[PDB]
Amino acid sequence: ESNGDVFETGTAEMYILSEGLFNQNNSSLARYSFNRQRCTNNYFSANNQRGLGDTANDIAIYGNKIYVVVNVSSTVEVIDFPTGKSIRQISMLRDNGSSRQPRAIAFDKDKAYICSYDGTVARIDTTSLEIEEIVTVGRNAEDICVQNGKLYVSNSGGLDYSGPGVDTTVSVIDITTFKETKKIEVGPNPGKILPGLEEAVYVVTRGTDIEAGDYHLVKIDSRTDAVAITYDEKVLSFAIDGPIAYLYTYDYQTKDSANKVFDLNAGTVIRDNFITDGTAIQTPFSIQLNPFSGNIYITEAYNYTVKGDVLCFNQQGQLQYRLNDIGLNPNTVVFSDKASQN
Numbered sequence: 340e341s342n343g344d345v346f347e348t349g350t351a352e353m354y355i356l357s358e359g360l361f362n363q364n365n366s367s368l369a370r371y372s373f374n375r376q377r378c379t380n381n382y383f384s385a386n387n388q389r390g391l392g393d394t395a396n397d398i399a400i401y402g403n404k405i406y407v408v409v410n411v412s413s414t415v416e417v418i419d420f421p422t423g424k425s426i427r428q429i430s431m432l433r434d435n436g437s438s439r440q441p442r443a444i445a446f447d448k449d450k451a452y453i454c455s456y457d458g459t460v461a462r463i464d465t466t467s468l469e470i471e472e473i474v475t476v477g478r479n480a481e482d483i484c485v486q487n488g489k490l491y492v493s494n495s496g497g498l499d500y501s502g503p504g505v506d507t508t509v510s511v512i513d514i515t516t517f518k519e520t521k522k523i524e525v526g527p528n529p530g531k532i533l534p535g536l537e538e539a540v541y542v543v544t545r546g547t548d549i550e551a552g553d554y555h556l557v558k559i560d561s562r563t564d565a566v567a568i569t570y571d572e573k574v575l576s577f578a579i580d581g582p583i584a585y586l587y588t589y590d591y592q593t594k595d596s597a598n599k600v601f602d603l604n605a606g607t608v609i610r611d612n613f614i615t616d617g618t619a620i621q622t623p624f625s626i627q628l629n630p631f632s633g634n635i636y637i638t639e640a641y642n643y644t645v646k647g648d649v650l651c652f653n654q655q656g657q658l659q660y661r662l663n664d665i666g667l668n669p670n671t672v673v674f675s676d677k678a679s680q681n
């Protein structure tokens with residue numbers, strides 16, 4: 340169930356999103372209350388008497404709402420934060436009525452922006468919860484963030500691995516006009532994209548063949564909308580803490596992996612093994628900072644067919660605590676400094 344004193348600084352609660360398995364309709368949403376000292380595994384269903392859906396791929400708290408992007412069900416579930424009750428299921432559909440297959444969400448002002456596999460971004464209003472506009476980006480949008488009055492969308496072209504091939508750009512959208520202003524060439528199969536200091540946007544590129552392990556982190560400059568730096572370190576996913584990145588890399592062929600601390604300014608490894616206390620992770624599956632405490636959260640997916648765990652590390656790579664069997668394939672952890680009225 341749990342190991343270590345389960346404890347956080349400055350944080351009332353965390354939510355853990357589990358994707359389950361492709362076409363098993365078994366995504367789930369867990370909640371651990373720090374205030375109440377209480378773990379609920381099935382917080383969406385328990386409160387709404389229906390499942391979150393198939394391949395839940397993203398979660399964010401913003402305003403007083405929780406948004407879950409559901410890829411295969413092709414929906415954005417919106418949940419009232421205080422009560423935990425569904426407000427709305429927003430169906431994400433092509434003009435012909437087919438699945439857009441949304442991937443990721445980002446917010447600016449009172450608007451949300453969702454990117455999908457069909458190569459589009461949808462603007463959604465955070466009050467009306469209606470889709471207002473669509474704009475096209477590149478192929479198979481994978482991820483999205485905001486930096487400097489602009490959205491940056493990873494054009495993975497991931498689903499084209501066998502046809503035209505993976506895509507190679509980050510689209511830039513101007514928020515005020517919701518017009519796509521440029522495609523910045525970054526490298527093959529871009530993925531996770533996070534904003535950083537000095538108007539920086541960082542993106543991983545996963546290579547033309549994901550099994551090969553040709554992973555780069557690229558830094559974009561948002562002032563000029565050009566690449567600033569391409570690093571040499573093999574990065575599959577990362578989280579930023581100022582000029583420090585917490586990253587990992589995983590080899591699908593050899594199941595070997597590494598978790599590291601990395602200096603974004605010098606482009607050098609600070610510590611070759613983030614973990615300093617000898618805690619094993621077989622399948623690191625996400626990595627993110629708790630912004631209220633600066634702890635590092637990594638998920639363990641094991642072999643993708645048993646329930647995964649959540650692990651909390653201080654920045655010195657000592658494990659604080661872990662929550663075991665939290666969900667099937669936990670891929671995102673999020674944090675509230677304010678308790679839900681639940």
Ligand code: NA
Nearest residue numbers: 368381383384
């Ligand atoms: Na659930």
Ligand code: NA
Nearest residue numbers: 420421423679
């Ligand atoms: Na809630």
Ligand code: NA
Nearest residue numbers: 456479498499
């Ligand atoms: Na495609």
Ligand code: NA
Nearest residue numbers: 483484532533
């Ligand atoms: Na992101």
Ligand code: NA
Nearest residue numbers: 546548552553
């Ligand atoms: Na590769």
Ligand code: NA
Nearest residue numbers: 645646647668
């Ligand atoms: Na799992």
